[PDB]
């Protein structure tokens with residue numbers, strides 16, 4: 179059998195989730211003889227051949243379509259034709275913003291199995307069994323795909339481990355199907371606002387979320403961060419609201435705090451997208467009045483207490 | 498001019514919730530229901546279009562779900578949606594994102610809107626699939642994770658910004674009519690927490706039990722279970738003792 183992996187690139191760079199998918203594909207296959215086929219799609223995608231000629235890639239297909247970077251019409255048409263060509267048992271896409279634009283469309287047209295944001299996947303005998311979350315990550319939901327000879331999964335980033343080393347795939351070039359896209363990509367744009375601190379470089383963060391309530395409550399945490407010698411960061415709602423600059427936002431659509439050794443998450447529930455920015459932090463302290471908050475599932479230390487009471491007492495003790 | 502906004506009433510769980518005896522879902526007694534957060538932003542975006550326009554813009558909200566959903570639809574009407582539609586029959590129980598996409602499309606075919614808005618994802622299941630599935634059955638242009646929309650009623654193109662990973666956006670010019678999935682933060686919904694709801698059956702939209710429900714979904718639930726998850730080291734006692742431990746941790750770090 180063949181497992182098909184759709185790589186991802188943007189602005190001339192391969193997104194490393196691509197290599198996680200290769201790891202997943204290799205881990206998933208039932209037999210030595212099964213092959214992993216990777217595809218990379220774009221009008222300039224030959225550039226990625228070296229970076230995808232890696233351990234665990236049996237075939238590497240460069241798909242030349244009409245756009246440089248992701249386009250949903252181009253991608254759906256291209257991946258449909260790859261599925262036709264390779265008859266894969268399993269197709270792995272990253273659960274990324276790009277995949278969101280087409281994965282479920284791809285799956286609506288045909289009789290393919292489909293599940294998204296999957297974080298456990300295995301064969302039980304010949305039966306593919308995927309696990310994803312339910313109810314804001316409070317349960318696991320385990321699914322299978324009865325009768326489906328092709329199953330398309332989107333895979334949660336930062337769960338499956340990449341393989342190490344180079345590889346020697348059979349490299350091929352195909353043109354994408356010739357259908358005109360119903361959209362055209364224009365400028366990339368940097369999220370706006372100030373940039374006085376690069377939060378990917380800082381070692382000690384105090385981070386505020388929706389639990390702070392009103393914008394008038396931001397100042398006391400700014401003070402606390404200053405008194406403590408921490409950098410003030412936030413979850414998406416705080417930055418969406420304009421209360422702190424987007425350069426201070428932690429998580430998938432914000433920044434990954436790669437240098438952070440100590441992260442104090444105050445009034446943050448721990449959504450999967452927030453965690454993407456900070457789950458690697460060696461010492462996470464969570465301060466949150468909801469003991470059911472997802473954040474406690476990755477914190478080293480938990481305090482189920484009011485953030486304002488804690489902040490004022492911390493400020494006093496620090497003084 | 499008409500914008501159709503697909504909305505979901507999501508379920509959040511109370512503490513100490515239990516899995517059903519059949520092991521397929523959580524016991525409904527532990528569920529609290531509300532409008533999906535992403536739908537607040539999508540509905541607000543439609544309303545912003547309505548208000549910016551001299552031309553009439555009909556804003557129609559549509560939901561596939563059982564009678565509990567009428568509460569959420571009523572609240573949408575109270576915020577200025579012009580019409581609200583609930584599609585249901587018990588046979589639709591267990592319908593996944595793709596099947597819901599199909600059901601929605603049957604309503605949309607009849608409403609023939611100029612734009613369709615969906616949320617990026619649901620807070621409960623977070624499939625991030627339903628809206629783009631609609632776009633497939635409609636065969637319409639589409640884009641997911643829209644953080645900005647420049648659109649005037651009647652235009653045959655719109656410019657959107659997709660919110661990408663790592664602090665960048667991408668502008669995309671898209672043919673209209675289109676299906677857009679709308680991201681948190683696109684706007685600031687103004688009503689942050691007698692005309693009836695139109696009730697539609699499967700028969701009303703040409704569907705039957707064999708078109709919907711768990712049997713027609715693209716994956717089968719084997720079980721739902723409370724997994725073992727990581728456990729924090731909880732610091733009990735007084736605010737002073739809790740703060741003192743945080744400071745011991747800061748000093749240990751430095």
Ligand SMILES: Cc1cc2nc3c(=O)[nH]c(=O)nc-3n(C[C@H](O)[C@H](O)[C@H](O)COP(=O)(O)OP(=O)(O)OC[C@H]3O[C@@H](n4cnc5c(N)ncnc54)[C@H](O)[C@@H]3O)c2cc1C
Nearest residue numbers: 387388389413414429430431432445446447451467468485
């Ligand atoms: C594609 C996409 C990209 C995303 N990117 C990001 C991203 O980069 N960053 C990000 O943060 N999110 C991101 N999200 C948004 C995410 O889904 C959540 O909306 C967000 O992370 C929730 O932020 P929050 O934890 O601050 O708010 P909530 O989930 O509302 O949590 C607030 C918390 O405060 C607690 N609380 C309330 N009052 C108090 C009190 N007095 N004392 C102590 N605790 C209190 C509550 O118990 C709760 O747990 C993204 C989502 C999508 C779909």
Ligand SMILES: Nc1ncnc2c1ncn2[C@@H]1O[C@H](COP(=O)(O)O)[C@@H](O)[C@H]1O
Nearest residue numbers: 503504561615616618619624625626627
């Ligand atoms: N049952 C439903 N009725 C109407 N719209 C829905 C329904 N389920 C999902 N949606 C739409 O899809 C979004 C959620 O995405 P998803 O995670 O794919 O369910 C919601 O914000 C709605 O726009």
